Symmetry: C4
Subunit: 181 residues, 4 copies
């Protein structure tokens, strides 16, 4: 079937139909992959507004959104609040331990879960999910392993593409309402 | 029909001939859609100096400039003040309201209004205005709907491109004076 | 003759031999064209490190560097302070007034001056210098007016390219010394 | 000879096998070369998180990591502290002096040392090491001097590429554990 980013396989479209939960990586997926650091200890990161719209569409379209992260950075919390993301696991050695608790807390099967990644630490979780996604400019070794590879880059609208995919496959796209924030 | 950005249709030029008001979204139009967020609630947005020049030219050549955006930040007011933009609406995802307020306060028919946007949230207003513009890298679903697609990406001089177009259509480009600020 | 950016005309090379002073624009030449603003009135601009190396070379090679800019900004002052740029003109409406005052203060003729600009306000001065330069991604209407059009974009090493050219033209590139700061 | 970024020469792979120390430049190598400066003395620099993971991998796989940079900023110390780089030299433009101190302190030969650079100031050291690396978007004059030129630009994963290269040559890539931070 066709999408506004180009055609996708029937298999990928079938996986996208069943997703109840979308897990997102922060750095290199939601952001341009950079961490901005100051002399007085400031730490800034950038998120894509059009990604936000996709995320808010997904949340109003009965798709839950979650984030798994290595270190408890306050900005990610603030960003989650802005978009209304209540599921934020921070300070995570494994992404597997956080992944298991998410499935317990929501009683959702692994095949009903999508994950978007960009580096090799993202894989162990992507191996077990229903739809595994790698961003266009993800690490060369992650790309061939994922079920789907986005056309758009990390922090440039790749998350929007996946949201857009999940909506289309589930036939909620035309009616989906979000905020570009 | 000739512009410094490439050929444009007689229809778009005839539409641009009549613009008394230029409405702009911020994120993905006046910026590349990025939001920088810090660990102490620091927010940063990036604006384009040549977009500024074009806005200055537009305002000194009897064309009003307005802004309607979904987010709300002090920095946006500051940029507005720097450029002499007196009409701004923030924290608004139903953009039809702010738009209707503008049609009242400036006594201006909707077909004398140009609107530049990048996401689907912008379209409700774009459908009603005289000249609707989508930026080169606007969300793929917006692009086919617009009257004119800019050559230049949001945050890189798409606004400048749009200001350039109106001024040329009104015979004002040659003389127009601005400050690249 | 040939350079590390591609061949250049005999004329452009001949003009570069005589350059004793290189005037630079800040926005869109030394910067990515962007101005980063914040909620507590913060303002940040980005400068390229390899531009630093070039400016340092030029200054130790009997080529003065000057900047004409429309505002006062401490960040610019600090940038000039880092690279040893003493001649900084701040708050200039016209650039011609600053250009005359620069010419009289240094006892240097118009043909020994080079200017690197990116927008239509740089032209009134660019017209009067020996070597005028528009950066790769300058406003489309400025590009055909310049003597030389850089291969590298504004804020990416365009200034380095112009330093690299001046130096080579004067037989100083091989022996030049700078710091990538 | 096959990597995930593409084929490298047999000589480069033999060189990479013997690397026991990796020396990095910061500006233009670990970053895209931009320096963010503000009105209050705020300074920012962007590092690449996937670069971090490579460095973390190199450090945990018996390959020491060191930094010599022309600039001086507390922010760099923060970065090295996060990644675990104990060997750091700032405000050092004659980079040979730090290079001398490094070999002396680690009791290690130059032919076991690898250097990634982006500008000419990086060459006097690069000339002496066993594996010299220019980034994809290094200065045109540095590119042909290096043993190897990365496929990825500085600050987009050029350092990660080199980390992947050493690890592969030393058979340590598959098992290498790091953190994308
Ligand atoms: Cl919006
Ligand atoms: Cl200017
Ligand atoms: Cl350096
Ligand atoms: Mg990541
Ligand atoms: Mg928008
Ligand atoms: Mg300028
Ligand atoms: Mg450097």
């Amino acid at each position: 079937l066709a999408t506004c980013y180009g055609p996708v396989s029937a298999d990928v479209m079938a996986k996208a139909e069943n997703i109840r939960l979308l897990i997102l990586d922060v750095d290199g997926v939601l952001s341009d992959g950079l961490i901005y650091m100051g002399n007085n200890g400031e730490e800034l990161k950038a998120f894509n507004v059009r990604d936000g719209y996709g995320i808010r569409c997904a949340l109003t379209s009965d798709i839950e959104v979650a984030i798994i992260t290595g270190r408890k950075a306050k900005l990610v919390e603030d960003r989650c609040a802005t978009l209304g993301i209540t599921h934020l696991y921070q300070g995570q050695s494994n992404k597997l331990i956080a992944f298991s608790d998410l499935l317990e807390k929501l009683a959702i099967a692994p095949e009903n879960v999508a994950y978007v990644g960009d580096d090799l630490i993202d894989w162990p979780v992507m191996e077990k999910v229903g739809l595994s996604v790698a961003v266009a400019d993800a690490h060369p070794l992650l790309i061939p392993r994922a079920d789907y590879v986005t056309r758009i880059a990390g922090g440039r609208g790749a998350v929007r593409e996946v949201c857009d995919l999940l909506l289309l496959a589930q036939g909620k796209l035309d009616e989906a309402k979000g905020q570009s924030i």
